[PDB]
């Protein structure tokens, strides 16, 4: 007998089911999704009741006018994240306006704003249109920067090239800070993920990946390696989290996610 703390959650969750059937041909009603996921709290926050997870994860989704894709993302990922026993929150970073979309800058915004809410220590950066096909593909951080979407159906279930880091990735707070976050000036130029990969390598990090069999993803309807090595080395410490500027225009907590609408400026 005696007062005692809740145990850490196990290394691997015993709740995982493995393969999942992913389809995008039926309607989704978020009110029904919330009712089927009653343990997910306002703003799309969840943590296990019976154990403490070492994975305090902010899932950051760059976004603009793709509500149907987001509804599928929520419908599929909330059950998966709870089965993975993560202490997580969902952040949809909505780019205000009509100017060119800037994926990497919105991801940086997500890192900085999610930290205002809670002491997250792991960050998953996910396009809104990528859904995992196996729940053994952990949505959390590892000893090295994690590439999650490693075998995408749109690329024939094969990695485009070994240095490809697009789609869905995860970086611990330490990993993200040491590369000064992501570049802010990729205004649809292409290759922002290759720049991120170059930053990680320059800092001595490598890429961790799940086994490809469980790393498969479906895309809701072959890239090549843009080169920028010298450029990334030149600019990574002066363009990134330290130089990030934006204005928060709206913050909405919905039952299944927090949506932060931001004005990130225009190409300079």
Curated annotation (Swiss-Prot):
Cofactor(s) annotated in UniProt: Mn(2+)
Impact upon substituting residue 161 to G: Reduction in N-acetylglucosamine binding
Post-translational modification: The soluble form derives from the membrane forms by proteolytic processing.
Pathway as given in its UniProt record: Protein modification; protein glycosylation
Phenotype when changing residue 164 to F: No change in enzymatic activity
Reaction(s) catalysed by this chain's protein: D-glucose + UDP-alpha-D-galactose = lactose + UDP + H(+); an N-acetyl-beta-D-glucosaminyl derivative + UDP-alpha-D-galactose = a beta-D-galactosyl-(1->4)-N-acetyl-beta-D-glucosaminyl derivative + UDP + H(+); N-acetyl-D-glucosamine + UDP-alpha-D-galactose = beta-D-galactosyl-(1->4)-N-acetyl-D-glucosamine + UDP + H(+); a beta-D-GlcNAc-(1->3)-beta-D-Gal-(1->4)-beta-D-Glc-(1<->1)-Cer(d18:1(4E)) + UDP-alpha-D-galactose = a neolactoside nLc4Cer(d18:1(4E)) + UDP + H(+)
Effect seen on changing residue 186 to G: Reduction in N-acetylglucosamine and UDP-galactose binding
Keyword tRNA-binding: no
One GO MF term attached to the UniProt entry: N-acetyllactosamine synthase activity
Intervals, Lumenal compartment: 5-268
Tissue: Ubiquitously expressed, but at very low levels in fetal and adult brain.
Residues annotated to bind UDP-alpha-D-galactose: 62-66, 101-103, 128-129, 189
Record-annotated disulphide pairs: 9-51, 122-141
Keywords for the protein's UniProt record, in alphabetical order: Cell membrane, Cell projection, Congenital disorder of glycosylation, Disease variant, Disulfide bond, Glycoprotein, Glycosyltransferase, Golgi apparatus, Lipid metabolism, Manganese, Membrane, Metal-binding, Secreted, Signal-anchor, Transferase, Transmembrane, Transmembrane helix
Keyword Transcription regulation: no
Sequence positions that bind Mn(2+): 129
GO cellular component: azurophil granule membrane; basolateral plasma membrane; brush border membrane; desmosome; external side of plasma membrane; extracellular exosome; extracellular space; filopodium
Residues that bind N-acetyl-D-glucosamine: 191-194, 225
E.C. number: 2.4.1.-, 2.4.1.38, 2.4.1.22, 2.4.1.90
Gene Ontology biological process terms in this record: acute inflammatory response; angiogenesis involved in wound healing; binding of sperm to zona pellucida; cell adhesion; development of secondary sexual characteristics; epithelial cell development; epithelial cell proliferation; extracellular matrix organization
Subunit structure: Homodimer; and heterodimer with alpha-lactalbumin to form lactose synthase. Interacts (via N-terminal cytoplasmic domain) with UBE2Q1 (via N-terminus); the interaction is direct.
Disease implication from the record: Congenital disorder of glycosylation 2D: A multisystem disorder caused by a defect in glycoprotein biosynthesis and characterized by under-glycosylated serum glycoproteins. Congenital disorders of glycosylation result in a wide variety of clinical features, such as defects in the nervous system development, psychomotor retardation, dysmorphic features, hypotonia, coagulation disorders, and immunodeficiency. The broad spectrum of features reflects the critical role of N-glycoproteins during embryonic development, differentiation, and maintenance of cell functions.
Family affiliation: Belongs to the glycosyltransferase 7 family.
Protein name as catalogued: Beta-1,4-galactosyltransferase 1
Record organism: Homo sapiens
Portion held of the full protein: 126 to 398 of 398
């Amino acid at each position: 007998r005696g007062s005692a703390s809740l145990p850490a959650c196990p290394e691997e969750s015993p709740l995982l089911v493995g393969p999942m059937l992913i389809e995008f041909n039926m309607p989704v009603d978020l009110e029904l999704v919330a009712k089927q996921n009653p343990n997910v709290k306002m703003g799309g926050r969840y943590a296990p009741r019976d154990c403490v997870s070492p994975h305090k994860v902010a899932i950051i989704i760059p976004f603009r006018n793709r509500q149907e894709h987001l509804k599928y993302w929520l419908y599929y990922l909330h059950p998966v994240l709870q089965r993975q026993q993560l202490d997580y929150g969902i952040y949809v970073i909505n780019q205000a306006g009509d100017t060119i979309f800037n994926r990497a800058k919105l991801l940086n915004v997500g890192f900085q704003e999610a930290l205002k809410d809670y002491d997250y220590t792991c960050f998953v950066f996910s396009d809104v249109d990528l859904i995992p096909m196996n729940d053994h593909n952990a949505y959390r951080c590892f000893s090295q920067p994690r590439h999650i979407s490693v075998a995408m159906d749109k690329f024939g279930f094969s990695l485009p090239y070994v240095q490809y880091f697009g789609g869905v990735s995860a970086l611990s707070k330490q990993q993200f800070l040491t590369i000064n976050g992501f570049p802010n000036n990729y205004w649809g130029w292409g290759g922002e993920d290759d720049d991120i990969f170059n930053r990680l390598v320059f800092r001595g990090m490598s890429i961790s990946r799940p086994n490809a069999v469980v790393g498969t993803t479906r895309h809701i309807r072959n890239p090549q390696r843009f080169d920028r090595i010298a450029h990334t080395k030149e600019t990574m410490l002066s363009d990134g989290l330290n130089s990030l500027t934006y204005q928060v225009l709206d913050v909405q907590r919905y039952p299944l996610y927090t949506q932060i609408t931001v004005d990130i400026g225009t190409p300079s």
